[PDB]
Each structure stands twice: as structure tokens, then as C-alpha cells.
Design an enzyme around this catalytic site. Sequence first.
Site, PDB file in Angstrom:
ATOM      1  CG  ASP A 116     118.190  36.629  58.186  1.00  0.00           C
ATOM      2  OD1 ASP A 116     117.085  37.230  58.403  1.00  0.00           O
ATOM      3  OD2 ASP A 116     118.246  35.399  58.033  1.00  0.00           O
TER       4      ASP A 116
ATOM      5  CG  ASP B  31     118.607  33.022  55.124  1.00  0.00           C
ATOM      6  OD1 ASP B  31     119.792  32.816  54.822  1.00  0.00           O
ATOM      7  OD2 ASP B  31     118.211  33.110  56.295  1.00  0.00           O
TER       8      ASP B  31
ATOM      9  CG  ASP C 256     114.780  35.612  56.350  1.00  0.00           C
ATOM     10  OD1 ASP C 256     115.881  35.045  56.277  1.00  0.00           O
ATOM     11  OD2 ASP C 256     114.300  36.098  57.428  1.00  0.00           O
TER      12      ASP C 256
HETATM   13  N1  LIG Z   1     118.150  30.260  57.562  1.00  0.00           N
HETATM   14  C1  LIG Z   1     116.873  29.789  57.800  1.00  0.00           C
HETATM   15  N2  LIG Z   1     116.626  28.477  57.892  1.00  0.00           N
HETATM   16  C2  LIG Z   1     115.402  28.021  58.142  1.00  0.00           C
HETATM   17  N3  LIG Z   1     114.366  28.829  58.309  1.00  0.00           N
HETATM   18  C3  LIG Z   1     114.518  30.160  58.212  1.00  0.00           C
HETATM   19  C4  LIG Z   1     115.798  30.689  57.946  1.00  0.00           C
HETATM   20  N4  LIG Z   1     115.668  32.038  57.887  1.00  0.00           N
HETATM   21  C5  LIG Z   1     114.425  32.356  58.082  1.00  0.00           C
HETATM   22  N5  LIG Z   1     113.674  31.240  58.304  1.00  0.00           N
HETATM   23  C6  LIG Z   1     112.237  31.174  58.580  1.00  0.00           C
HETATM   24  O1  LIG Z   1     111.527  32.453  58.468  1.00  0.00           O
HETATM   25  C7  LIG Z   1     111.368  33.057  59.789  1.00  0.00           C
HETATM   26  C8  LIG Z   1     112.568  33.987  59.984  1.00  0.00           C
HETATM   27  O2  LIG Z   1     113.600  33.248  60.575  1.00  0.00           O
HETATM   28  P1  LIG Z   1     114.996  33.912  60.994  1.00  0.00           P
HETATM   29  O3  LIG Z   1     115.597  34.286  59.684  1.00  0.00           O
HETATM   30  O4  LIG Z   1     115.939  32.759  61.606  1.00  0.00           O
HETATM   31  C9  LIG Z   1     115.187  35.494  61.784  1.00  0.00           C
HETATM   32  P2  LIG Z   1     113.731  36.534  62.004  1.00  0.00           P
HETATM   33  O5  LIG Z   1     112.460  35.922  62.796  1.00  0.00           O
HETATM   34  O6  LIG Z   1     113.334  36.759  60.634  1.00  0.00           O
HETATM   35  O7  LIG Z   1     114.157  37.956  62.624  1.00  0.00           O
HETATM   36  P3  LIG Z   1     115.664  38.492  62.255  1.00  0.00           P
HETATM   37  O8  LIG Z   1     116.463  37.528  61.259  1.00  0.00           O
HETATM   38  O9  LIG Z   1     115.389  39.743  61.499  1.00  0.00           O
HETATM   39  O10 LIG Z   1     116.552  38.855  63.522  1.00  0.00           O
HETATM   40  C10 LIG Z   1     111.376  31.836  60.735  1.00  0.00           C
HETATM   41  O11 LIG Z   1     110.035  31.542  61.132  1.00  0.00           O
HETATM   42  C11 LIG Z   1     112.003  30.638  59.998  1.00  0.00           C
HETATM   43  O12 LIG Z   1     111.149  29.496  59.980  1.00  0.00           O
HETATM   44 MN   LIG Z   2     115.268  36.848  59.382  1.00  0.00          MN
HETATM   45 MN   LIG Z   3     116.892  33.965  57.754  1.00  0.00          MN
END
Ligand SMILES: Nc1ncnc2c1ncn2[C@@H]1O[C@H](COP(=O)(O)CP(=O)(O)OP(=O)(O)O)[C@@H](O)[C@H]1O
Ligand SMILES: [Mn+2]
Ligand SMILES: [Mn+2]
Length: 359
Positions: free
Chosen positions: A195, A283, A197
Site C-alpha cells: 500500500d 491509507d 500511506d
Molecule cells: N492500515 C493501517 N492501520 C494502522 N496502522 C497503519 C496502517 N497502515 C500503516 N500503518 C502504520 O504505518 C506503518 C506502516 O504500516 P503498514 O501499512 O501496515 C505496511 P509497511 O510497514 O508500510 O510496508 P508495506 O505496506 O509497504 O508492505 C506501521 O508502523 C503502522 O503503524
Molecule cells: Mn504501508
Molecule cells: Mn498502510
Amino acid sequence: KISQYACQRRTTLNNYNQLFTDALDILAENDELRENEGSCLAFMRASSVLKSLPFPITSMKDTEGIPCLGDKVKSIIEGIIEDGESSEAKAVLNDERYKSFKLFTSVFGVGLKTAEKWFRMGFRTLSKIQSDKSLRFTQMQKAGFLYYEDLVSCVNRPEAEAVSMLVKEAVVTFLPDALVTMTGGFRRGKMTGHDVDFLITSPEATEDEEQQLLHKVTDFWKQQGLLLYCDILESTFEKFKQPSRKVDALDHFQKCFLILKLDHGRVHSEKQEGKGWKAIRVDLVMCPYDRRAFALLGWTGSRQFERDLRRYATHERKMMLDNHALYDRTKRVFLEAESEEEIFAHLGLDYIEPWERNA
Ligand SMILES: Nc1ncnc2c1ncn2[C@@H]1O[C@H](COP(=O)(O)CP(=O)(O)OP(=O)(O)O)[C@@H](O)[C@H]1O
Ligand SMILES: [Mn+2]
Ligand SMILES: [Mn+2]
Ligand code: NA
């Protein structure tokens, strides 16, 4: 001397120990599925510390002085040194429950409970689940199945940047002073992600303006025909509450979980091909301006880096840290920060760059 805390280690994407850590990550994932929280944590900490090494382990002697490597973990490392494979991780990869859980939860909207339910009903394939005439799906699962191929393919950096442009263009239309930051894996330097963010904050917006922005931005995309899925979680943020004591702290800020339609023409890559667009998981988080450094730090990750940051704050500094604040239990004061660097300085930690937080 390597610290037991990920927040006192630099963990970059040049992982020299992927042979060991891929096996440890599989074993940790299986322990999560089998509800063995303790064994899961021990394998996650071992995998994390090996990810921080600047060299590959090539003998058991190389593991001397490395923390978080118990007897069970050292047996797994020994077996991989022996023939280049982990028999333990290989058995998990061939386990029917593990295969089903990985496959079912790869669908957006499917968690541990629904995956367990489908397994106990005798389902083993996504084709049999989707075509079943008796199953009832949530709106999240319907979107998860409809955009499955796009969501399961990796989001790359040109796509993440194209999404960033869309987010910024929409946000400044309603709040021109807003600051939009790409967080998560991509901020840690990753080439791909599941995703994209973003953290959104505005220095001059009111409490009401802050609350309405995510509704305005998603309605704008709905009018454009770009909003494929949308779930807005209203804020439960409390300005004067003490930060969380939990191992895995909950985020109380207003947020939204989206699926956006990304037109191929907006992507400036090396490479229309098919339908001419790609479904992207996005997100968005909105936070009060004064908490932007705590939110940025929490949303940058990795999950292991965040867990160890909070554990270090509690056990070593008698401080309480979460995505919203930093509280000093000895001084009995909330500590202010305008940047991540100021948070690290309050904690007595050397600053760890975002690309060094891949714990
Ligand atoms: N849908 C969600 N709900 C809660 N926290 C989220 C989130 N998306 C991101 N975060 C927060 O921001 C960081 C990213 O989380 P994640 O989105 O679940 C995937 P990532 O570590 O970004 O790698 P990736 O999504 O690229 O595979 C996390 O430390 C988390 O706390
Ligand atoms: Mn992410
Ligand atoms: Mn996310
Ligand atoms: Na899922």
C-alpha cells in the site's frame, strides 16, 4: 556490542542474512497463526537482530555476542549453515493450515478469524471461495476479491509517487497549508509495498476543518470516479490522556483505508498494457499539528522498530510513548517535539534515519 533494541540498531535494506531471516519470519508467522505469542516474539526479535548485521553469518562462531539468539533459534541457524535450507521453515511452507491462512488473508478484508472459518469449512482455494453460492462477504472482502490481482501485485515507487501527487492535489484543494508526507515502507526506502500511506497535518486548520478534510477529499475522488473502496474511521483522540502502555499501541487519529483507481497515464515509469489503470491500497491519517512528529514516527515503522522504541521508552527511560505523545513519568510532564530528531533526543537515543528503521 549490539543492542537488544531495534531503536539502538541501524537496519538497512541490504540484508546479508535473508537465508536465516526468511526462515525465522516464516516460523514467527506460523506461531502467530497457532496463537503462540511467546514463540512468535522470540523468532521476530532474532530475525530483527540478524537483519541489522553488516555481514552474512557463515558459521556458528559468527553468532557469538549477538543478543536475542536463544537455543531454539541457534539450532535453526545451524541447520541452514549445514545445507542452505531450514527443515523447520520447509515443514511450515508445506503445512495445509499455514498455506490456507497465507492464501486467504492475502485478500483485502480477510483476517485470521475468517481464514480459520473457511479452512474449517473445507475451503483451500480462492476460486472455490469466490464461486460459492452460500458464502456471504463483507463490502471490504468484495473489494478484496474484485481488485485481487492489482492489490497482490507490488505497488512500485513510480506508482507511489503518482498516488502522492493525487493525494496532495486533492488535500490542498480544501486545506492549502496542509503538509502531506508519504510514510510506511516507502519512507524507509523500500522499492515496493502492499500500500501507500500518508500523514496529513495542517498548522492553521480548526478542529472541525481537520475532521472534515478526509470526507471532502474522498467525496472529490468519488465524483472523479477514482474511489473504488473507502472506510473512514472517526478520531477517538484525547488531547490530555497518558500514552498507551500496550505492547502494540492503537492509533486514535482520524484515518481512512482506501482503494484508488490509478490511471496508467499518471505513472512516469520505464514502462495501455491492459485496462489502463491499477487499483492501489492507500491509507490516509489526519493528525493535530502539534502531534505531527509522534504520528510521523509511528506511521514510518517498521512494526518491530515501533515495538522496541516503546519498550525502550518504558523499561529504560520510564517514559510512555505512542503515535500521539511522549510522557515522562519521573518529571510528570508531556514532552513536546517538532521533529522525530527531538523525540530521539528526549529518549536519549542516537537518531536513526527512516531508511535505517527496517527492523
Ligand atoms: N492500515 C493501517 N492501520 C494502522 N496502522 C497503519 C496502517 N497502515 C500503516 N500503518 C502504520 O504505518 C506503518 C506502516 O504500516 P503498514 O501499512 O501496515 C505496511 P509497511 O510497514 O508500510 O510496508 P508495506 O505496506 O509497504 O508492505 C506501521 O508502523 C503502522 O503503524
Ligand atoms: Mn504501508
Ligand atoms: Mn498502510
Ligand atoms: Na487480509
